[PDB]
């Protein structure tokens, strides 16, 4: 909470969870990224920049690869087609 | 998309003399259109004009007109890919 309120005041503190030894709970595959982009990278998504530039929010997202697919990190190569 | 067939069925049932036959021929047209895309539909029931064809017959769904008649026996080498 001390992080989150301090983040809401306009000065987000970075990497406080490195040695806190406590981390927030998140679904398997994703790690608690301090100031993750609210703009995800789902496999079926149109690449529209400058229209998804909302404020950053703390939360947990997939690893560096592993684009989202219905709340389950999968490698960018295996994005399934939909019809 | 079954919208055109819906309009066709309403028109046929209201306008024609015998609404039973028109309804059971409009549903059949839609079913044939669907089965032209691979999707077979089982729409026939006692309240929906299940075919009562002669006594020595029986209704099927995926028939085999290769050997149904027996001129095919008279001409076996003749192709029957159907």
């Amino acid at each position: 909470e001390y992080a989150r309120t301090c983040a809401q005041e306009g000065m987000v503190l970075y990497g406080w969870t490195d040695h806190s030894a406590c981390s927030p709970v998140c679904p398997a595959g994703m790690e608690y990224r301090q100031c993750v982009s609210p703009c995800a990278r789902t496999c079926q998504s149109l690449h529209i920049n400058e229209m998804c530039q909302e404020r950053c929010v703390d939360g947990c997202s997939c690893p560096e690869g592993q684009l989202l697919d219905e709340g389950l990190c999968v490698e960018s190569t295996e994005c399934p087609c939909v019809h | 998309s079954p919208l055109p067939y819906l309009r066709n069925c309403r028109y046929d049932v209201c306008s024609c003399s015998d609404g039973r036959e028109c309804l059971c021929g409009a549903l059949a047209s839609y079913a044939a259109a669907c089965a032209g895309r691979g999707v077979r539909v089982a729409w026939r029931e006692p309240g929906r004009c299940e075919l009562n064809c002669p006594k020595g017959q029986v209704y099927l769904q995926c028939g085999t007109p290769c050997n149904l008649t027996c001129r095919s026996l008279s001409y076996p080498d003749e192709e029957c890919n159907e």
């Binding site: 998504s45 529209i48 229209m51 939909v82 | 079954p2």
Partner: protein, 196 residues
Amino acid sequence: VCDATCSTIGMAHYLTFDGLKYLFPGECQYVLVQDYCGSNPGTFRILVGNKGCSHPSVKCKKRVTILVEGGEIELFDGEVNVKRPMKDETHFEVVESGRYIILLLGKALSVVWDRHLSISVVLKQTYQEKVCGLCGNFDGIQNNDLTSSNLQVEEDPVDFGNSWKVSSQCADTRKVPLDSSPATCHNNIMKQTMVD
């Protein structure tokens, strides 16, 4: 070859560039028409966003954002806001007449808005099979207008519509049963004949 106009007829109906009307009651923000289409360079990315209008009602807000040559304009509550300014301001001309706002966004691209719900983008033959979005590719052929973003033709307008959803985490519109009397005419035959 004459010009061509999209049209957002009513609140959930669209009229593509090749004269195809369809029904798509969205809730999210969609790509009404864009030029960043395939291997083309592309210039503009007009977007339309629905708010509270899956069921056509008297709230039904709409907002269009035009991302043409850099800066982006947006139309909301009968007003035009130029959030970021176009780099060739010689082209921009927001002429207002009658009950409509007419935006002249260059040579071949223009937009007509009736301040409430009707939106119509007008193109000249410059584009001519270079666009896509909820308005088809504008190539004279009316059959292939439902090509979703996956470059495949969909037989159902709602699928082709959800394909153009800008944010891939908001709600897909449901496949509503097909009936003539949508919501309140459902069992009110009196009202049905009245509206007829």
